[PDB]
């Protein structure tokens with residue numbers, strides 16, 4: 001099934017995206033110049049459920065995995081439903097270094 005993939009740097013305080021797959025840029029309409037070095041939340045908009053945004057904010061603080069269903073918006077403003085799974089990548093000393101994300105457009 002079609003999916004996209006990003007990597008966030010958890011050594012920086014606000015988890016900026018440091019790598020994105022070609023499908024991520026193609027699905028959202030943003031280019032690497034507007035994606036790299038930024039937190040993923042720019043994809044959110046009016047109808048994004050803050051209860052689910054909270055679930056990811058908390059899971060990132062606690063360094064746990066998480067899977068939420070988020071209303072996101074393309075660059076041209078049109079919406080799409082984003083099934084998002086965030087996975088923590090730890091160093092051998094237990095510290096979280098990166099977060100990785102699989103995003104599926106589940107608008108069907």
Ligand SMILES: *[C@@]12=NC3=[C]C([C])=C([C])[C]=C3N([C][C]([O])[C]([O])[C]([O])[C]OP([O])([O])=O)C1=NC(=O)[N]C2=O
Nearest residue numbers: 008015039040041043044053056057099100101103
């Ligand atoms: C975004 N994908 C995504 C991928 C990774 C690896 C991580 C760590 C986060 C996301 N987010 C969410 C965003 O970065 C942030 O974690 C949340 O908005 C909650 O934090 P705040 O401080 O804003 O309450 C993703 N958010 C999206 O909307 N779409 C994704 O694809």
